């Protein structure tokens, strides 16, 4: 697959951290694709045109889909944006998204 660039190594590090046990209390809703039928949210795919989640980001990293850090970051941010778009701002899952995005943005800012 070829060695990840230095910046994408940092991105992969961030991804591993987001999936790690220390953040699980607020990261878990973002681990896998939203299953709209399972959750009973039958309007989800009318509202969210481009679903994203951490397992999909991980697959894309493993498959070398991301050509740079910017592309990676856009997907992680898309995941958070979908959450902010679908849910009311006072929902528990939105608070969790904000917390995980704080973890993400502060470490992404430490890009070599
Ligand atoms: C799908 C919409 C929303 C919902 O109303 O579910 C019933 C959902 N809430 C939740 C959610 C609701 C309350 C709390 Cl405390 C945590 C997550 C949700 C749950 C599981 C899951 O994957 C297994 C994804 C979730 N998620 C994400 C991401 N963004 N919005 C949600
Ligand atoms: C809570 C906002 O939607 C995202 O905040 C990012 C900041 C680094 O906490
Ligand atoms: Cl972006």
Swiss-Prot record:
Highest taxon in the source lineage: Eukaryota
Localization per record: Nucleus; Chromosome
Transmembrane segments: none
Domain Bromo as annotated: residue spans: 3-111
Assembly and interaction partners: Homodimer. Interacts with E2F1. Interacts with (acetylated) STAT3; promoting STAT3 recruitment to chromatin. Interacts with CTCF; promoting BRD2 recruitment to chromatin.
Comment field on protein domains: The first bromo domain specifically recognizes histone H4 acetylated at 'Lys-12' (H4K12ac). It also specifically binds histone H4 acetyl-methylated at 'Lys-5' and 'Lys-12' (H4K5acme and H4K12acme, respectively). The second bromo domain recognizes and binds histone H4 acetylated at 'Lys-5' and 'Lys-12' (H4K5ac and H4K12ac, respectively).
Family: Belongs to the BET family.
Function: Chromatin reader protein that specifically recognizes and binds histone H4 acetylated at 'Lys-5' and 'Lys-12' (H4K5ac and H4K12ac, respectively), thereby controlling gene expression and remodeling chromatin structures. Recruits transcription factors and coactivators to target gene sites, and activates RNA polymerase II machinery for transcriptional elongation.
Remaining remarks: Some specific inhibitors of BRD2 that prevent binding to acetylated histone are promising therapeutic molecules for the treatment of cancers or inflammatory diseases. ABBV-744, a small molecule, has been tested on tumors with success: ABBV-744 antiproliferative activity is mainly restricted to cell lines of acute myeloid leukaemia and prostate cancer and is able to displace BRD4 from chromatin. GSK046 (iBET-BD2), which specifically inhibits the second bromo domain, is a promising therapeutic small molecule for the treatment of inflammatory and autoimmune diseases.
Name this protein carries in UniProt: Bromodomain-containing protein 2
Gene (name only): BRD2
């Amino acid at each position: 697959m070829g060695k990840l660039s230095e910046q994408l190594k940092h991105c992969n590090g961030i991804l591993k951290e987001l999936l790690s046990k220390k953040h699980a209390a607020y990261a878990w809703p973002f681990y896998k694709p939203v299953d709209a039928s399972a959750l009973g949210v039958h309007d989800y795919h009318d509202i969210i045109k481009h679903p994203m989640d951490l397992s999909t980001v991980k697959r894309k990293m493993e498959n070398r889909d991301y050509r740079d850090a910017q592309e990676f970051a856009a997907d992680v941010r898309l995941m958070f944006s979908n959450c902010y778009k679908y849910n009311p701002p006072d929902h528990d899952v939105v608070a969790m998204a904000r917390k995980l995005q704080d973890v993400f943005e502060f470490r992404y800012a430490k890009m070599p």
